[model samples]
Target: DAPMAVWLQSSLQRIFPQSPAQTAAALELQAARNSRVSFQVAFRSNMKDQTHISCSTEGAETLHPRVRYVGLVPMPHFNTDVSPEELDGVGYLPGWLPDPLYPVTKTEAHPFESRSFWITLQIPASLSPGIHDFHVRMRWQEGKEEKDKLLHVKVKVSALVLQPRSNFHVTHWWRGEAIALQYETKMFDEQWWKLTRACMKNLIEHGNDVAFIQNFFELRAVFKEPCQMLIVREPSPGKYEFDWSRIKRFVDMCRELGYKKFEWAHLWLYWGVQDAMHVYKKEGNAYKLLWAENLSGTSDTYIHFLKQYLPQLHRFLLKENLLSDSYFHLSDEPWSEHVENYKKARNILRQLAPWMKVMDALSDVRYGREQLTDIPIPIISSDEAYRKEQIPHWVYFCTGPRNKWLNRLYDTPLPKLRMSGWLFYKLKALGFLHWGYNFWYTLDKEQPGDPFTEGAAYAYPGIAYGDPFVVYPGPDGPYDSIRWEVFSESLQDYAILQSAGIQPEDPMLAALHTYEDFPRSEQWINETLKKILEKA
Candidate 1:
């Protein structure tokens, strides 16, 4: 008998306890030129401690197959195990989330430590169409005995290169403070900028094209000071001076990184906008809160600040040529419970900056009824109302759209994540919005939670295991999670569907009537993508 166990799994499958002999020892995939195709090799020590394990691809040096070890983070709580359609979803013990893919492939293994490694083949657009074969060997040593396993991966390069992502706006709110806090880099320094570039490049490659402009907001107390694009100053009482240097640099950085649109931070505070977002006055090297928490959204003092700030904001946007590509926001997730408070803040904001168009995420469709927001982003659960009322809107899902509904939580099946593209295409969602990209801060606290341990950021129940963030913190940069990988592939499928000219009423997508109910299975996604490519 062998001293080690090995098998191959689909890249969409998250790591969990599995029968070593059950999974196939080989993989086959179809990839268009200029695309990255991936899968995983699962392994464990069957007897003694194994050491010096490394991966090598035998037949694809031209393709430059990347082999990385997939790291596992404990997700103690598995929120809402399955969609109504999927019953056998929870396939392992709780808290076995696979994330933090590492560049290092060689590692030692103990008896109980079941693990998996990732392999990605980058195909060039100029590469000729043919059958590409890769022999991934997992080499390891048990005491003085050397052993290895073979994972044969065959990738059939398609006849054509992949089409570029169509005009789909993908937005994931990235926390700059989270970046500074996690890396311990001083905010806005060269070190911070370097790290930010690394993280942003990942986003751009992952099909998210919209740049989220924090602009000194999003950090109520997550970090020592909020990261800002626009620097604020007070030359005198009720007099504000704005410096556009930082904002200009930020816009240039993202523009250079291939971002097409910019999402300005919320003008009013989140959750009903009853209070104003705190602005800090920079005096020399330090900053102090201007209103000191003693002001409401419509307070005379705050309005005075907005009147000065909004005009300067407009001039800055116009000056930098970002006004046409910019989308403004008011507040976040304000339902009908606080409709009056929301409308009051919206009125005040419009009265000051009439040129600025607004889009905000809310559960209440009445917010759209009043036309308080020009572009409405509603949660997928409540989107039925918006569609029933014939309101044009975007769609998003956080922790709340759980149970049988479609979500991207840790407990969510990979098949469900793959459905994201088909659902969006079928439902005709204008854009996609998700708040967590790397929001590491704990709820109601200022400390950055350890992502490897606190998957929920200590905000369970309300926040599902994987809802808060998709990527994990790493020393060099952010590590891609299984969720992030599958989600990106889902978008590529979106681009493929769009390129294939699949209409909303197409027969292939007849099952996806709504986000809450649809075909949630691996068999379906594979078949659907195959059919899409065949049609193309």
Candidate 2:
């Protein structure tokens, strides 16, 4: 009996370790208003796993005291947006106000191979200025008994104040405003630009819809929209065979439109292609190797020919009062069956359009050292799965067809969600393209032989299940609100990274509000971009 009594006493002592009497972290205040504050608590308490039974074949509940209710008390006050009425009968006790009553706008659980959950708390815009307390009390349930274990932290809310917007929005971070191109449908296709001009009786169109110019100081315009340049099958013909006078005529026409700058898509058109190449391609035989006959770098190779070309093109587009921004593509997707030829084509574009992109569905992991060097890549390839053909232009929001919950078909199978995040991070880090918003086009139903339905899953908000073109209302069916909120929050994280001159790591690889493993490539890009931007 003495030995048994001693054993029982020792076992109970081992099972019941002392809980910390005081547990809390210091809170800090933030000033000038519309900001948010949050704190995190890492649960690190000892656990006791033991067997306890009442009778043969019957078991009594094993105790987990650590799961019992624990408490946290903020020192001086609890400041929150929750009205005194809203706090009534809530979990927190009187005298101690609870967290603000931002209703959970949405909740969603995507139980794929992995499980994820999201909850949106719309913090009220109104709360008295002061420090507020937030407590989370988790209690373990054993039969009907409950324990009060609480965690708390203070949040300081400084006074609300609004000032003039004429403050920090337009600081010049570069030597001069970065040049951006802005054009409209008139400049889209030679044909369209021409007709639109005709429709307006030769009046200048697309005067103001330009975000590109927002950061640029000087405006440059290529030839007026729909400025047709004959794609000659053979340049060997004498100059007279193709009317050289046409350019002069086009210049005259742009001037007639009252444009401010004038230029054509390529500089060589005026100086002649062969002459332009020799003068510009200082890198030798690489020039011939790049402008292969089958696929040419006419678009991008032209941009970097020389800044003098800038004056020439600038005058052309401005003659018609039109803005000049052009498009260039490195290699078409599916890269054609002619692998060798496409490789040559890729090489040419790389040599010429170092600033242009040649993106495809290929993961950043696919390009080894060489393809990853020197030039700007992914000049402009769509994630094949989410290409325009795959998504209809009519259906919108997280509802209707093409929602995340309804479909997953794509040009390629959907990578796990996290994988998609990495692709976006890679594009930004490697290329410095931080302005690609989810393209805002109306959704249309897919037609056969198109890239739309054949490729990705639902066409909801944020990402449609291919590359990381994030949207707000995800394509997650009727319950898309929550997914979109989380998605938007993630986008904000990327914005924060950009503001800090940091490339945001792909959310797919790592999550902000969720748990997972995402790579840290953005940091690498940041370091690289910093070196480049500093020199620039």
Candidate 3:
């Protein structure tokens, strides 16, 4: 009776004259790195679960709504580099950079917002007298982030300068061992520093490019035309090698261009290879691998993996140093709920060679926000900073966190601009990968997960007009406006950003909080694009 009565009372409660938060004098916030900033505010709502509560600057209005909701929330469709949607709860900014294996989510609590969170370090032992600056920002989740609910929140920083106890005399500072940065107003660069801005911009923009980048060394490319007809024919004796003449022709062009290191981007595994299928024993283990000749001799099956075929492949790519820099990966996205087993299988392949790095043609890094810490993270393509000193191909994909990337391509600079970011990082990273590089193709690979299609701003792939891969017989033209123009222009833009001399340590995206929201962040993308396009 007590529980039922309480439930009834709670449900039947009447709405009261709840007042909105009175705009207060922006509370000046300043503190040391490890210190926490606390604030007391009274939120009044008679509603039982007021999780959709929102607050904003008095006159500041944003396009995103200010409520919270949930959904079936597809798994593979995600990107961590860009803020997927404008929403937030109690967690890291940029919405906790979702991890599929280990998902994390925010809640209707404190710590995420409504409180001041930041980091600052002490001055070091080096003999340098100068000033330093630290910028801060706050992010809120928005729109149909999970379900369709209007979710909005606001954050404001009052204090711009936080000086250490001044003693008229300043001490030296070390980069790593000594001290990080002691906030000082006296240390200001006389001239505007663009390099730091450019570097940070590229980092955050191409942060998600790591998966493609790290796998760059193992990536394989195949040339093929999009044809409605499925063509297959045994062309060799004893062994079965189907004729992918169309695809082979494209590969030939790349080879001529010094891209001698190439591998077949085959999808025979998924499209039902007649004689190559391995029957699975649902309850038991896998069957033994039996050496077989041509598929014609075998039953109707899929294309088989001939491990011995590697010696020849090795010989081809090894002729040049490219194979050492090439990568081979499955064209699939592994999600926790939909394909956890696939990710596990991929890891097993990685153990095969100390030099080999397995990659997901597509790996969904954004998922459950609650299990962020517990998630098994190889790396956050979103935060490319952590792996800066590590191997190159270890880099992973980032963008896709937001729901409307197609729109972002228009309102924001992506693909090309983003590609330039990749080139910049690759110059340092050593690895990279990307999907969709041709315009006008009937193939399903370009359509399955991609959002942009029609519209004048529609993006597919192309770098040139006369380029053989892009010329006629080119309904699936290789080079087009997106690459030759946008990608090329973006590269020059990125080069300029670098020419300005940005440091790895400088804040590219002034809004980033932890080391997790690494290079080429959303803030960096927006800020830098505005400058490049002169829209700022």
Candidate 4:
């Protein structure tokens, strides 16, 4: 008595974290030549027991040579209705949360419970421009059940490659703790580099132009700073030495991976209006703070340190040829109430290192009007005002601006996720930024949540399931998500449009407005691309 069933579905948002819906299916998958495409087929057992499923591809030979079969990776979702809150004296959401799915697998599922996995196919830019076909088969219960699924793959390889210069500058803050946790290796270890390279290569492949240089310590409520400066108990007070090894390794790795821009984790301590210099001493493989004054922007010690350090840092950037591409930040997002203090910090940075381009994610336009930032990244809601002022700036969206604002959250519909790239181009924004690329954290990053189960363990309650990170840490490297793939595809739309000579002033762009205003049907995007290519 065996009852097993398997079928094909889009997996676009079929398993959106905490959302109970399996209502969509994909007849065929489409892609641009020299691009990455993904879709999912879910499997289940009607019998009252657990069983294993094995998936493989056929007719792969019919595909272009560049189109290679990237094997199956697990897909797990979380549920919660949590929001960010001010808790435990910290302004951000909870850091420590539970892991909902710690150990993920593709084979086993309880009766009636479906397990979905991604079938990734990569089409290189060199592939011949045409349609292809492939088949994916699921075998379970020792040949007792088997189902062969057909997939129609259409590859429209563009004549041009995505140039780094014209595309939007993208930066999603990366957490080193997550990397270390994912690979079970310490920072700077050879094994760590192996894991890091694998993960970073994945980022570069997915249209990330900027890289986060993690040469400093960044964790919630920590006493020691972890800058790479070689500080020691020198013969005199207020003296420090420097080391270039750690910083050099990070920058070199990013360059090797072809990241065009660099974003310093941060300069000043988080939260505006407070004077704190991130300086420390090495203590038994860890850094220990040398001062206890809680240094503010105006603190003599903080100013003195920057006076000495910024020039050295500037010299290092010059040596690395990254002076022009590097972007710096004073604080994450300083509210309007702390405008005065933010200005003071900006002034200090200006006096010490005007060469450093300082930018922050602040919604208030006054920051730009008052010239507080050189690159003011306004939230989507407040960006229109800056646009009207002719300020060449960037935009961002996180938890808020949802329902109406352009976002890629899990609960949001697939159309919205697919619409972001169009809206970015339509708005003529220079860049886009999001803080969490892989910010897998509990209440604090110092603690590791079960990557499979907790989904960063209730960081903000329910939304933490997929809100914090897009890709999951797999045994081999970073596992791709449907959300991540579609977002990348949306960016590709921008690239495709630009390569096809579509301009911001073009009449066709007006059809795309807010997240909800975009064309609802998936075919709309394909048609848009087709129309533009014909025009080209």
Candidate 5:
């Protein structure tokens, strides 16, 4: 018996083909040079037993080819309605979520079930514009029955070549210790470096230009060892000496890995700045906290350390010429109630290192109004207030902002996720920040959990599924999730806008009012593409 069906479709949505009538669909896609485009070739099984499936590419010699098999992972939703007290869900169902794009293209397909093979094409920046033809050859065999299918894909590489996305900064908060813990590599070991480099390189390739650097234990993620960069030595009681080797090497690695900007981890704790960041000392290969768990950020114990620490930090940044390219942070998400102490912490840091531009995520717009954080990152739901005030700031979203608002949860529609870059562009948002890139821990930050099965942050309805991380931990390094892959496409849309020299408030993007209210669909993107292409 032959296969049930075969067709080509966009990567924006999951495919579930019905019936045995085969439909060979041809792909017609458009992109500027220096772009990354992706689509899917779906295969449906008609046999009553398991069969082997193999997929390969043809005539993609010039373009970098990555033929991946889309694998599904478990997902359980609390509600089905698009809007609800519990959740607003589009892909609202109790079943497997089609994520975890695997590199191996050959897998066993179950009878009467559908499988998807992903085709990713990376167009070189300098490549000449023209129509590029490619083919995906799919093979299916079950015992004596065998079938072969070749699907054609047409890519129109327009003459409009995009300059890299600019004027906007993107960051994904990472935990290096998570990498070491997930891979079982000792902290700072050669294997850990290899894995970290691999994952960071993946981030840069996906258009995330910021590197994560931590000096203190701000995140409650307990690790196998201290993962902080700044190592301190106490020669005597209250006298502090510093080592900048680890910090320097970390920056050096980021540069070599192709990150453009860097972010210093928060100087204080999250939610509020009542306490000082945890500092550590190494004795006999064991790390011990130098200060009390309840130490205040403005107290002399920490103020003295910062007085010594920030000066050395300035010297390093000045010598390395990273002063202009790097950004700093205070607390994670302090409320207006903490403004008094937050201002105190900010004052301490400014006096020590006046060159630092401190940015932080906050719940209240008053933080930006009162100038607590030099660059406040407001959640997408409330960013409109900042815009009305003409306050230049970045935007961030966690589990909230559902129900037509832009978010990248597992159940959030692909079109919504792909709207990220364009929304940022149209809204004139100075930058974008996401707390999760590879947070492999649960909500409580207790320990490591498998991101594949534990898609939620070990607690549902609160963290929401896929809020903890984007990329999955693979054998070699981090594996790109469907959300991560599609999100990258959204950034490329921003690149297209940049290439056309379009202003943010241009008439073309009037349909995009707010993050929660935007024309979200593939057809909308295609229509906008014509406008962009024509303008370019």
Candidate 6:
């Protein structure tokens, strides 16, 4: 029987496709000590009809404990104009499901649908440094005959160790309840917890050290509101009772999962709402307003509420020992035109929770230059001005920087996403931040939509399909996206290069030196990484 056509791909700096004739479809991957390595094996079927493939791995007995079969989940493709009712008719599962794994590797595939399975290899620092061998065997029936292709994998474990600390400090917002709602479960229900765990695990594995606690209720946006606050109660006329249960649960869960860096919910308020601070009391399952007024930084009402609220929040944080590594947001994306308001808000926070440092995502470098924000996270495109200042500042990119800069948008090529780490290393950025992790919300964070259909729909012009999230919500947990896989690979590359003492300005990194635009040549990045590896 003829063999099913298969090719091997590895994420070095770039995704390289090699054939049987090229290294016999063998993998040559490098990983720093105590780090994980991931790549993909693309399986293609020439069969006119659907075919089933079985997958298994052999060899490397010593490394088996660290190896995992992270099968590919379905990747969804949807249209923005398509209504929810129309999307509902299409069903919950994605149109195309790829990367089936383990005991149930069997899957039906159309002749033209592209599919690939991802492989993750973990190398313990204690393991003797050398090249390890393994085989990934895929079998399927072809014309009434059994056929298979043996993929040889060569894992090169470098003596170098990617230290726990790098300049790479990263954070992304996690929409906890959104997952529960999307899956039709209670907030802390076992099903919800499972999905939560899955999402957190994926976040940590992808070089994200910072976790955002979405505890503050009420909507904080210029467009629309999505959730209610965790603190809800009026014990006395003006005294409010804060509920530490829900916030504490999320914090403890993150800690259990080995996350230390945390950020509390924003305090200053959001959007065009007249009421800067909105408080409510719980009446059964509904919320009844305790205080309703338009409060601003200069307002006595706002000050009085903060005078009471901040101390309690601070006390709880102190008791939990989260004050040290924790950060607080004053407001999000405050323009320079609003400088006076932002400064007043900053001053109020300073007078209240002086120990808590504030950080906000703003595209304007003027805020940083003028010392308005304690820790300014400028948009990657607009970050060049701050980069020259050479202080500890982070960078981010939303929908606007697409096409030219490094972003994980659906339409952008994989190379653009994969090159992000190199660019970060080149710029020597202290951290990276993006607003959307699992936004899963409709336009304006209004309501949860079929993520498969309307992606971060609330985004100004509607988020490009994959722009809203890097992972998809799964019944049991989260499903990884190719975009996330490549993005994580880029982070790993940055770690390895940093461990090797490679500087941002090194000649080897010239291919990724562009700040205004992304490099188009895949070979350039591949060659640059190859050179770095050889030098290392």
The candidate scoring highest on lDDT is 5
Residue 94, candidate 3: alpha-carbon lDDT:
15
Ten-residue segment with the worst summed lDDT in candidate 4?
85-94
Q: List the candidate numbers ranked by lDDT, top first.
A: 5, 1, 6, 4, 3, 2
Write candidate 3's Cα lDDT for 1-536 as tens digits. 10000000010011111222233323322211211122222222223332332222222222111211110111122223324342221123212211111011223422222211111122222312222222222223233242222212222221222222111110000010000011111111211112212222222222211111110111111112112111222335334333333323333433443332333232213221222322111112222222232332123232233332333345544554545545454323434453443433333333332344333332234321221211222223333433333323222232232322211122122332343433333334233333322222222222222112221112222211111111001111111222223332333333434433443344443433322323333344445533432311
Candidates in order have lDDT scores of 0.79, 0.25, 0.25, 0.63, 0.81, 0.65
Total residue pair clashes for candidate 1: 1
| Candidate 5: regions farther than 4 A off | 16-24, 78-92, 221-224
Per-residue C-alpha lDDT of model 5 across residues 69-167, encoded as one tens digit per residue: 888887766422246422323333557677888989898878777778888888887887778888888887857877788888998888888787778
My TM-score estimates for the predictions, one after another, are: 0.95, 0.28, 0.35, 0.83, 0.95, 0.85
Worst 10 residues of 5 by lDDT: 79-88
**Residue 239 lDDT, candidate 1, scale 0-100:** 91
Ranking by TM-score: 5, 1, 6, 4, 3, 2
lDDT of 1 at 273: 81
Task: Compare candidates 3 and 6 on lDDT and give the better one.
Answer: 6
Q: Which stretches of candidate 2 lie over 4 Å from their true place?
A: 1-329, 332-339, 350-361, 364-368, 372-484, 494-536
Better of 4 and 6 by lDDT: 6
Q: Report the lDDT tens digits of candidate 1 across residue range 1-536.
A: 46677777888776664434345788878777777777888887676554667777888888888888888777665565444445223556474567778878787776755688888778888988878877888888878977887788888776656778776789999887777777777778887888788788889888888998888566555234667767887878889898988778778899999987999888777776877787877666666777756468878888999899899898988888888999889888886788888778878877888788899997788877778789999999888888888888989988777777777877777888888978888888888999889887776465667888887778776677777789888787888878888888888777767766889899989999888889988899888777765554
TM-score of candidate 2 against the unseen true structure: 0.28
Q: Which regions in candidate 6 have their CA more than 4 angstroms from the true location?
A: 1-3, 11-24, 61-104, 221-229, 271-277, 293-298, 458-461, 518-520
Off-target runs (Cα >4 Å) in candidate 3 are 1-238, 241-252, 255-304, 319-322, 337-356, 362-399, 403-408, 411-432, 442-479, 482-484, 497-501, 507-536
Cα miss at 394, model 6 (Å)? Answer: 1.1
Give me the displacement of residue 446 in model 5, in angstroms.
Answer: 4.3
In the order shown, what is each candidate's alpha-carbon RMSD? Answer: 2.1, 22.2, 21.7, 5.9, 2.3, 5.8
- Residue 372's lDDT within candidate 3 is 20
